[PDB]
Each structure stands twice: as structure tokens, then as C-alpha cells.
Design a protein around this ligand. Sequence first.
Ligand SMILES: [Mg+2]
Ligand SMILES: [Mg+2]
Ligand SMILES: [Mg+2]
Ligand SMILES: [Mg+2]
Ligand SMILES: [Mg+2]
Ligand SMILES: [Mg+2]
Ligand SMILES: [Mg+2]
Ligand SMILES: [Mg+2]
Ligand SMILES: [Mg+2]
Ligand SMILES: [Mg+2]
Length: 1105
Amino acid sequence: GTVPVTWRLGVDVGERSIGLAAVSYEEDKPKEILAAVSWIHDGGVGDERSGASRLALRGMARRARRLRRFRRARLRDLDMLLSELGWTPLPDKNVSPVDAWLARKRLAEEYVVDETERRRLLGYAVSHMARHRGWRNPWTTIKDLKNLPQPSDSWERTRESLEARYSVSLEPGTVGQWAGYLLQRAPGIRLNPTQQSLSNATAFETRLRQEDVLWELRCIADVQGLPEDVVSNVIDAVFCQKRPSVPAERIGRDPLDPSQLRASRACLEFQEYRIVAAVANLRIRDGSGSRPLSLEERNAVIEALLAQTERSLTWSDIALEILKLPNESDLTSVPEEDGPSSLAYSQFAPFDETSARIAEFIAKNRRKIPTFAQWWQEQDRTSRSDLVAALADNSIAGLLVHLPDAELEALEGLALPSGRVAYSRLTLSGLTRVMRDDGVDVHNARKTCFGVDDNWRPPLPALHEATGHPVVDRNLAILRKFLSSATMRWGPPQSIVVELARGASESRERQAEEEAARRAHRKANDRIRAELRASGLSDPSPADLVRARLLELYDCHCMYCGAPISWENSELDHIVPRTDGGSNRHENLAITCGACNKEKGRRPFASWAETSNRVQLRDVIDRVQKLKYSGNMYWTRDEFSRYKKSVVARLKRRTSDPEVIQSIESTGYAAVALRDRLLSYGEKNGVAQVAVFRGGVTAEARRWLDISIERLFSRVAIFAQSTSTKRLDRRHHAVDAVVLTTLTPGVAKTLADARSRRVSASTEEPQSPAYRQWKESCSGLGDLLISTAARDSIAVAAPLRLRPTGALHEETLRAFSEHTVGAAWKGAELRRIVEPEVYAAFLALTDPGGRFLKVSPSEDVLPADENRHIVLSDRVLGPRDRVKLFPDDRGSIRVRGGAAYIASFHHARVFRWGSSHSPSFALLRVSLADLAVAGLLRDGVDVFTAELPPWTPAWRYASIALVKAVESGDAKQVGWLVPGDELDFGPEGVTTAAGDLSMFLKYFPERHWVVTGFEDDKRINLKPAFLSAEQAEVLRTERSDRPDTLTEAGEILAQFFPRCWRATVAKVLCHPGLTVIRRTALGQPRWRRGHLPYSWRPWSADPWS
RNA sequence: GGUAGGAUGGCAAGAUCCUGGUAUGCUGGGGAGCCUGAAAAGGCUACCUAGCAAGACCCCUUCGUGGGGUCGCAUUCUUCACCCCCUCGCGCGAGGGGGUUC
DNA sequence: AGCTTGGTGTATA
DNA sequence: CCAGGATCTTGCCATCCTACCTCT
DNA sequence: TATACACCAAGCT
Ligand SMILES: [Mg+2]
Ligand SMILES: [Mg+2]
Ligand SMILES: [Mg+2]
Ligand SMILES: [Mg+2]
Ligand SMILES: [Mg+2]
Ligand SMILES: [Mg+2]
Ligand SMILES: [Mg+2]
Ligand SMILES: [Mg+2]
Ligand SMILES: [Mg+2]
Ligand SMILES: [Mg+2]
């Protein structure tokens, strides 16, 4: 029964959270909080230690599978070529460990007269070379690999280092020659640097290159006299590689023409569009005001801009010799940031970049492409545009000219500007046609060419369609469930309010220094772009620019060990590892030899330098601190100082603490994407407005409504001085959403001005009619929120993960143990029997009328019966026969000939037995490996109730009391628990606390707890629902920096978190009135039993039907 | 005007994936050197080789516990049930995507 | 002889 | 780690559109 | 505006 009410929706997006409020209004006064809920989500992250999202881990695993499958196919095709040549591939076994290396060495060194020996060594060498071929730019062809210098400079430096280290000069000094020589001279030497945790020097230090392996192949071919066609076939088989590709479904669509893909920046239509649009936005002085350029002025400037081979027309040049303006400042509306010494008029106007690159490539390589040079001078702009589009879109996964194949290879080697622009090629051609004909700008050209009005906006995505961004998708899924539920409860909202991750309350000095930072960044990047384009890099990436900057800043030396480095052997090490949240911000990037990076791994700089011998921590710190500010460089003075401090702080960390930087891109994207989808919902549902306000407006509105989280939720003081922030209670997201429902644009401007004035600095109330009206309308909001928190209606819930997907086991395969049948059997050895038939036979041997195994790990269950025979259904194992066992007394499954421990528990099944006045409880912890080996990872299976065989790790490592009670027939399954199920202990709270939980519950009497795991057969891990771990972690952080600022409650919280309540199942489920609460999207517990997970009481839940 | 939102282009700083690779690592099979040993078998350091989620679907084939091909760790209430949407698109049982109020 | 803490291994760059 | 493609965020400059808000 | 779990061992009642 839907009852319609006037209500507003408040949306607080977050990185790992979203606050959602449905607040019913009357006039502009809030009448009732219909629903306030903080939903805690994972941001797409499944494993916090891995750091990466589930989508990212799946993509990496899928691409590892794809790489290995194509490697299989490539090596099989090489085997076929070797069999056609008569060359014997290296066998799988019964060969010397250095047979391939010595074959490579001997074939490089001397001609082998015996044809049989020559073919065998050639096949050994080539098959091994294909297995270990080194690295190539994946976008380069095999012909491009052949055109590289041979060997690479990395291998020449390695060769010089090896000759100096070993006092011998091998000729010609190939990788195979040096490796075979060193594997014989120093047995047990490691070839490449590896991840560290005795430590001897490796043979090589830098990454092996495919041109080095190719040069060794050429040397072997020249020494052995192989025919050139044979060498060519072997090269194309060894260095075969799939070209990287872009799926076209990953490319966005033109908003005006959704059937068309967005155009590449390489397109000549986009180049023409850029020039014409920029000229259409310039203004000329007219009677102390600005006027648009006339049609003739526009055509003159546009023809001067298009007719360019190099970017040499500045805005001052355009004003002075092209426009014939009497003064340089007469040209107004220049699209550049204003700076000193007339920088805006010193900046370059756009040009046809693709035509300039193609003309440069033609004039440089007229020998290689004379037919293409003639065709390019022959054809017109439309045919050139079609050719350029084909050349720029050839990289799509899914030429009209009969060009010679060498010329086609040269053009595919030609580099064009990358990146997609907003419009399609057809749209750009039409829009540019309208502006060049009518003299209009982009807006009027869009109106004319596409028949739209001044109110036109691009089409927005709907609520049901995702972005592919994990944080945004989590926020969107939660919001759309909330909105669907709230719409069927109370109708559509009157208005929707969304908070955007933007901030404007900044000082003029802050604005000036950020402007100077942007100016210095642009000047340095333009310069470094110029020398990199002179060096041979067409379109430098941000990481290219960072690499050039750090190579200039450290004089082409490693930042860690000081070894000399170059462009191709350097690595950009994340000082804070990516798996520990480490960002790509340039203070987190260190230029590194590569050996230092590979040895450092995930370990922090200090925890690696402390025990290492290659680098010195203090030497690295002093080299960073000894950097001096030049006259002109990338950073400003303040930026250079803060950059050195950030780098030093990143080197100094001795623990795997997460990244210092709190990135807000995902929050901003979530806010903008959810706003676009809420605008779509409002168009489809007649919502009057979807307003947006900044975060600081919401914080200032909380300040001026006297909404304190510690007062609202009666949270005790954690600091001796001042009050705790909003983040101590996780309900603050829902509070922020409620506050967001009150905001109007005028009061938002007033509170933004007020907060900006207080940053630029007790206190003074804001002064505006909108502030007065909003304050009088939302005077009662404080009392309403106090009553809502008093009746505990603001819920904190995590969405459940019920799908049985993810990692089936741990990634480390383990060797099996062995145990003889006739020997004495302990309980743990009986629990570790791999084969289910042998396990069941031994189970029946220990207890005949039995389905489960009832043992203790330390008890000697069976004696050393010297004539014991285990009779399977396909074999009889005598007392001498050896039974395969899992290596450890923990849950594990057989995977690919080895043993793998089970992964995290998917769920726990709750079993209750005993009398009704005092029942006994136990958990059956079920992993995805249990479901996999039980065959339950299939269609039509309820994973929480489907039976698990006794040989599964779940039933093997259940508690002995649970096993005896299930076998005796008294224990029945009454429910299930997943990580994230809320345990509401009731108004009485937790009554079985002892030791540390009692001391935590004196100051934080939490009745709502979240299941986080099941750490053994008798325990469940619970953390409080309403309390944040980041607040406790920053308590621990500020405790070191400040003297005893934490209160008793602050210290108690700081030591309770993060392990929290490692609780006993018997001591948790013994609380009467404890409820396992599963909530609807509005934060309301699901009590009616339907086809969605519902709340249940472990005391009174019936056994499963 | 002032604030806010949106378009396009530029510039700056970032975030998320996607495609293709490399070098290790683990397990199985090996073994170059060293050591402990030998009437008495295993280590250590490397290197070689195969596999690297369990598995699923398709086609083989000059028949087999194999060969080849495409996939499989995302979309957090699994499965079931109901309702909605796009697509197997004749008012279809279906392939995906969404929602289910306490 | 059971619960409470403490430490640590887990596939990587 | 490597190259390099796609999607997007935030801030500033230029232009165009929208909406409301505030003081003479 | 964010980020460990399942196993293995001590430890004082
Ligand atoms: Mg917020
Ligand atoms: Mg490969
Ligand atoms: Mg290789
Ligand atoms: Mg090596
Ligand atoms: Mg690193
Ligand atoms: Mg929030
Ligand atoms: Mg290997
Ligand atoms: Mg090896
Ligand atoms: Mg496989
Ligand atoms: Mg579902």
C-alpha cells in the first residue's frame, strides 16, 4: 500500500559508504525522517591486503590465463616449425640443467660441423629462447624489433659490468653465452634479481630485451650459416606476440549521435573543429567592450592556424600580424590562463597536429613512402580524413589504397595523437561546416546542425546501467535499491539532493600558489615534451614525463642504490606499494634501476633498506634532501619543499601503513554519475529538481544547525581537548544525507561564504534572507534527529555477499604428505586424508556406524596394526601402502596435483541442539572450496542449505561437539551467517563480556555488531557496527604526536580496534533476544519471510525445511 | 552582476579499468654443482620443463581417459519466487540487467 | 580445559 | 614491473546554455 | 572520504 507524501532524498556518496535519507517535508519544514541509513560498502575491494578491487583482480587473472593460453599456442607453433626444420626441441626431462644455455653458448661461439649435433643444439637453443625471450614494446611489430639496435644498450651495460666483474670478455658476449659461462663458473648463481625476504649477487641486473635475444639469434645464425629464410621463420615464430587492442564497446558514444563512436583526437575533423571553435570564442575590443570576430577575421585567423607545420603562431602573433589589431591587448577572450610578462599572449594557438605529423613523416621518410607522399599530395581533406580515421582506429579490436607493404608498415609505424574527443567524426565535420559557413560558435552550430534548442543537454544514463567503476557501481547499486524501496513506500521524491566532492573555500594566497604551480607544470611539461619529441617519443604520457623529470633530477642514477640508469632500464617504483594503496602521484614515484624495485617488492623502504645491503636508508634520505631548487623547474619553491618532504616521509615508513593521500576521484565520479542517473530518474518520474551541493556546505550546515555526532549519539569524549569529529559514528553519513535534504541554493551560497571566511583566518552567525529562512524552516531538525537517534532508527548496514563466486582456494600449491596404512593413526592424520574414499574407509574403521569423523588432533585413534587392509571400491591398500595426506591439519583441497588451503569462509551454518531453556550452538564454517568439491557451484543450488559431504573441509574441521550433535541427530541447522550479518543484541546489550570487552562496553555499549569472520571452529569475529576503525587508527596516530590527548575511552577504543571482539560462538549465541538482523534498502530489518534474506532469532529459528 | 550546474576546447593534477608482455614464485617432473652420505637417499643453491584457480561449453577422430578452440575469481539480497526492462526481439520457455516496501 | 590475546602467512613486481 | 588504449574526476582559462539570489 | 582473516601458540585463571 503506497501512501504518497511530500519527501526529499539526500545522497551522500563515499569511498566505502553512502548515506541515504528520505525526509518527509511540509512547507519547507521537515516533518519526519522516513528513512535514514548509512550503508557501508567495500568500494569493490574484496581483499584489503591485495588492495585491488575484485574487478581488477579478475582482469589480472583473466589476462594471465590469456597470456598462458597464447604462450601455449605460440610454443606449439614453434615446435611445429622446429619439427619441419629437423631441429630437436629441448626435452621435458633427462637433460642437463645447463643443456640449453651451453647450446646457446656453443652455437654463438663456434661452427658445429656435425649436422645431427648442430640440429639438436639449434632446436634446444631456439625452444629455450622462445621460453625466455625478453621484453618488447607490445605495440611494436617484429619488423620494428628488427629495426632496433642490436644488442640493446641495457645489454651492453650488463656486458661491461660482467666483464669487469669476472675478468673475461666473451665474444660476442650474448646472453646465452654469458649465462652458460656463469652457470658453469659459479654454480648456483641466480640469473635475474628476485623478490627478497644467503643473499648473493645475481648474474644480470636489468630486464632482458627481445632485441638482445634477437641479436643472439642472429649471431648464432651467422656463426652456423643458417639460410636467411630459415632465420626469418624462426624469428617470426620466437617473437610472435598479439598486438594490444581496444574493444570498441569500451569507447564512448557521441552524445548528439549515439550510434557513432567518439572520434580520435588524430582525426582531421577534430583538428579543424578545435581551430574553428577556438577562433569562434575570441573577442575584439569594441567601444571598451568585447565583440565577436567578423567572418573575414575568422577566416583569416582560421586559415593561418590550419596552414601550419609547426606551432609558431602565438596569440600575440594572431592579434598583431594576422588580425592587424593596434595593440596586443585588443585581442580579448584568449583561452589561456592569465600570467605575468604577457604569458597568455605568449601561448601558442592550436594547429592541425595530425597533418603536421604526417607531413613531417613524409618529408623525413620520402624514400620509404613515395607512393604515399604522392597520394597525400593528391587527395583532398575528406579522403585524408577517412585514411587518418582508419589509421587511428586500426588499434580497435572490433585502407581503400593498394599501397606497397613496406609503405603500409611505415604508416602503421607512424604515430598519431591519441585520446577520444567528445564528438564523433560525422558530428565534428557537420559542426565545423556550420561554423565555417554561418560564422556561428559551437552552441549555435549544434542548434543548427542537430535541431536542438538552448535547453539541450546530452542524454544521461539510467539507474539500471553501470559505469564499470567499482566504487561508483557500489554506490549506484545501493542508491537504486534505496530509491526503488522508497518510491514504492512513499511515491517519488519531491526533490533529490546530491553532494558533490568539490571545494571552493580557499584563500587568495592558496589560489595564487596553485596558479603558479600550474604555470610551472605547463612550462616544464612543454619543455620536456620538446626534448622527448627530439629524442624520439611522439606522445609522452604522464609517466613518461615523470620518468624524464626524475632522470634529470637524479642525473640518470637510481634513487636507491645510486647505480647509473638510462631511459629503457629505469623503473618507476611506487615507494608506497600499489597493493598497500600506493598512488601514482609523483611524490610516490621513485626512479629505480629495476633490481632495487624487484628486491623491494611490497616491503616499505625502511623495512627493506634496514636488512638489505644494496641501499642505505640514510644515503637515500640525504640524496633526496640534497636536491636544490633550480631557477626554472617543474615545482615551485613551496611545491619543491613539500615534494621533498613527502618523498622523505614515504621512504621513512617502517610499517605497511596505507597511503597518506586520500584520493577523492572515486567520490567525485560517484557523485557525478549518481547525479546523472538521478536526473534520468527524475525525468522519468516527474521529480521537480535534483539539486547538488558541495561537502563543505553540508559540514557548515551541520555546524549552524548544532548537529553534533557525539551529542546526537551520546558518544563519550575520546580526546582530552576539543570534541571528536563526525567520523567516530558511522551514522554520520545518514545524518549528512538528512542535512542535505534541507539545503537550498541561496543558503548554500551563504554557508559557503561563511565557511570560506572562517578558513581565511568567533563565531558570527551568517547573515542572509536565505540563511534566516532555512534556519527557521529547519529549527526542528535537531530535535527530530535527536528523537530518531533515541529510537535507534538510523541504521548502519553492510550489503550481503551471497553469491558463491571468487577465489576457490589459496594460490599456493603445497606438497602432499604421506602416511602408511598399517601405522598408528592420530586424529589429525585422519583428518588430513586427501582421498574421500580412503577418508570414509578410515572413518568407518575408527567408528563403523558413522558418517562423520569424531577425533581430536592429539589423540592416538588407531594403533599400528601391521596387517590392516583398507578395502576401497577399486583397490585394496595393504598395511605397507601409503595414503596421500594434506600437509597441515587445516581445511584444504586437492588442486592440480597439489594441495591448496581453502580461501576465506563464504558463510557459516548455525546449528542448535539441546533443550530449549539452554541450547548449545555451533558454526559449520563453509568456504567456496567446500562448495566446489561438493559440486554445489552449479545452477539451482542454495549454497546455505545444500548438504555438504563429510569429507569436505567444512565437516572435517567442524568442532567435536557439533560433529557429535549432528551425528546423534539433535543438531539441526537453524540459520546461516555471512560476513556482514548484523547481530543486534537488543536493549540489554552484551552480557557475557570479560577482560577487555567489559572495559570497551563501559564506554561504548554497542548492541549492533558486524560479523567479520569465523577464526576457528568455536569462534566468530565481531566488530561494532556504529564505530569506525579509521577513528581508532587516527587516535593511535595522534597519540604519538601529542601528549596523552586521548581519554580513557580513546585509549580503550584504540586498543579494541582493529581485532575487536574475537568472540566465542557459545558466548554469543547464548544471549536471549539476540537477533541476526538483515535489513531492507531503507535500513529496516526484514521480518516477513519471503524470497529475500530475513531477520531471525537463533534461539527461536526453526530448523530449515 | 554573484553563486551553482551543464556543454565544448585548452591546460594542470589525478583515479579506474582494458589489452598485450616480461621476470620471478608455487606444485609436479628433472638435474648442473656442492654437501651429508653410501652395503644406508636425501638435502642446499641454481637452472630446465609442464601446469598455475576447481572446472564449463564446442568441435575432433586417420578414437580416447587424448589433440584443438572459446571461456571461467566483475556486476555484493546465492538458489528459489514475483514484478519490470533490453535483447532469443510474432500476445514464447528464453540470454542478460534491475527491483522486491517490515 | 576453555576462553583470551599475540603473532603471522597469505603469490609478486 | 613494462607500453599504451579506453572511461572518468578535480582545479584554472575562453565561449555558450540553464537556474536562482541580492542589493540599489 | 577507506581499507585482514584463518591458523597456530602461549597464558593465567
Ligand atoms: Mg559527503
Ligand atoms: Mg607469452
Ligand atoms: Mg618469454
Ligand atoms: Mg633468474
Ligand atoms: Mg616497487
Ligand atoms: Mg559520508
Ligand atoms: Mg621459471
Ligand atoms: Mg628455472
Ligand atoms: Mg587450465
Ligand atoms: Mg541478485
